[PDB]
Amino acid sequence: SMEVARAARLAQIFKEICDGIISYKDSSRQALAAPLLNLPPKKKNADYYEKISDPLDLITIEKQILTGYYKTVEAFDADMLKVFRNAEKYYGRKSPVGRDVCRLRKAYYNARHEASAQIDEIVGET
């Protein structure tokens, strides 16, 4: 098949997974991915951008998916996991935001495990 077609099929999968993370709610109906959605405004969180070198938020990922910016799942994985790592690096694995990010990763690995079959069928038309 044609690469842009492939990259669109993938994009659709990446958007579903990423929407699952953004929308993800605990039994308590509160959105765990909320802290991950927007990068703190530079002007009053100058200390953030000193601790994080390669900052990324879910809104940006969500935006780039729609473009076909992610041509492989590794590039996607890399971006999604960087947003989680940056969160733990800044708030601490033990903070309430790390307890959350931790749990969101599990969600991420399940949705990624489940998509894996479709992702292989696409990539393996090369």
Residue numbers in the entry: 2431 to 2556
Task: Show me the paper's own sentences about this structure.
Bromodomains (BRDs) are protein interaction modules that specifically recognize ε-N-lysine acetylation motifs, a key event in the reading process of epigenetic marks. The 61 BRDs in the human genome cluster into eight families based on structure/sequence similarity. Despite large sequence variations, all BRD modules share a conserved fold that comprises a left-handed bundle of four α helices (αZ, αA, αB, αC), linked by loop regions of variable length (ZA and BC loops), which line the Kac binding site and determine binding specificity. The four helices form a deep cavity that is extended by the two loop regions (ZA and BC loops), creating a largely hydrophobic Kac binding pocket.
BRDs are evolutionarily conserved and present in diverse nuclear proteins comprising HATs (GCN5, PCAF), ATP-dependent chromatin-remodeling complexes (BAZ1B), helicases (SMARCA), methyltransferases (MLL, ASH1L), transcriptional coactivators (TRIM/TIF1, TAFs) transcriptional mediators (TAF1), nuclear-scaffolding proteins (PB1), and the BET family (Muller et al., 2011).
